């Protein structure tokens, strides 16, 4: 898997004893979608 995805997962796990502030938790927990497009035609907004 991609290096920055690897680090991301590690960072998210790392915000776990928990003590953490909301902003830490937010950088490690966000909801979104990615709507792919085409050369037009859009593969639907799938949760990122």
């Amino acid at each position: 898997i991609s290096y920055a995805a690897y680090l991301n997962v590690a960072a998210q796990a790392i915000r776990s004893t928990e003590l953490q502030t909301a902003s830490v938790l937010n950088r490690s927990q966000t909801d979104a979608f990615y709507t792919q497009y085409k050369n037009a035609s859009e593969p639907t907004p799938i949760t990122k």
Partner: protein, 265 residues
Amino acid sequence: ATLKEVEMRLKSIKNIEKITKTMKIVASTRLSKAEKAKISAKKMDEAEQLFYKNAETKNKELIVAITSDKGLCGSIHSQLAKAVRRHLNDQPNADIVTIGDKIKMQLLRTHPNNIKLSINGIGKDAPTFQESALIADKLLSVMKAGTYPKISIFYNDPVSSLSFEPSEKPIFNAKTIEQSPSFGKFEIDTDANVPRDLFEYTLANQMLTAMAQGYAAEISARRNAMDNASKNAGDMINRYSILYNRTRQAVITNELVDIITGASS
């Protein structure tokens, strides 16, 4: 009536003035956090740039752009749209990944073909490492970013806390990193996958920075716009107030004439 239709419409404008005022205050509050983050983020980016500069790394084509899903932040969306469009005259066939519905809509008009990947759910959000990382992971897989030896990113550099100039930067793929002249002063193995990894890591770090610069500019612009909105609404309030006052008098006078006519009989 003139009087009632004026009065209700004037009340609407009054309420609008008040809301745009309210928004301007809330915007200032929101802006402070955005900027604060952006300092730290930008500092972090500079350290990576320290490598790229000293390395003299430098540079189909990718275009990425960042703006929110939401509108009414001023002309952040459309100054950015124009400057993307300027660089879309520079290469029409480049594949645009649009992060933000607003930048998507404007660009979709100039070319809809180039829209290849897009992000919905970033708009309201303040910069977050997780989003940037995930977008990067999808960017690598879906767009095969390295295949395009040119990458270009667009954002709004928040030139002044009343201004925003859309600005762009490249993200250095592993091929570039490989052939940079100083790269021996920096020491790593020829068997290392560090160029392709550093590319990936800075794909997210640069993208996050691009988001931070943009988001701060965006919220700042929104504050500016909402301040000016309160003023514009005010001018119309005054104009219609004079109309209201005149109309109030006019009703009295016209009625009075009727009273006089009646009295005369």
